[PDB]
Amino acid sequence: AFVVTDNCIKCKYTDCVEVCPVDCFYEGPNFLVIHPDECIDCALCEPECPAQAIFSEDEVPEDMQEFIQLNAELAEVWPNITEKKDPLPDAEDWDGVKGKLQHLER
Numbered sequence: 001a002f003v004v005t006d007n008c009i010k011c012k013y014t015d016c017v018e019v020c021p022v023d024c025f026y027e028g029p030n031f032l033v034i035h036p037d038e039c040i041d042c043a044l045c046e047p048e049c050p051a052q053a054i055f056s057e058d059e060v061p062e063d064m065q066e067f068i069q070l071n072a073e074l075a076e077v078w079p080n081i082t083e084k085k086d087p088l089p090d091a092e093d094w095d096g097v098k099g100k101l102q103h104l105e106r
């Protein structure tokens with residue numbers, strides 16, 4: 001499974017979904033998640049994230065291991081997203097800001 005981490009929050013560019021062959025991205029208010037059981041580890045989404053927020057589980061940074069279980073949990077509750085949409089208005093200002101998990105909305 002590929003996992004979306006911190007920098008996606010409040011950026012949510014959704015470029016990653018255009019490339020997914022199986023459509024396993026699920027949508028929240030200000031973040032996206034990959035459903036771990038449906039992902040086929042094709043790695044096609046990882047170059048597409050402008051925020052460089054997607055990682056293979058085995059390369060998820062040490063301080064971001066919470067995201068592995070979070071993507072799994074939330075993929076079960078959020079709706080599927082299969083088409084790109086515009087970034088959140090302010091995506092650029094928040095791109096690179098650290099600690100954005102405190103801003104996640106369910």
Ligand code: SF4
Nearest residue numbers: 020039040042043045
């Ligand atoms: S690695 Fe492939 S199947 Fe998994 S979320 Fe990314 S694009 Fe979709």
Ligand code: F3S
Nearest residue numbers: 008013014015016049
């Ligand atoms: S910012 Fe998030 S919505 Fe996709 S393109 Fe990157 S993982």
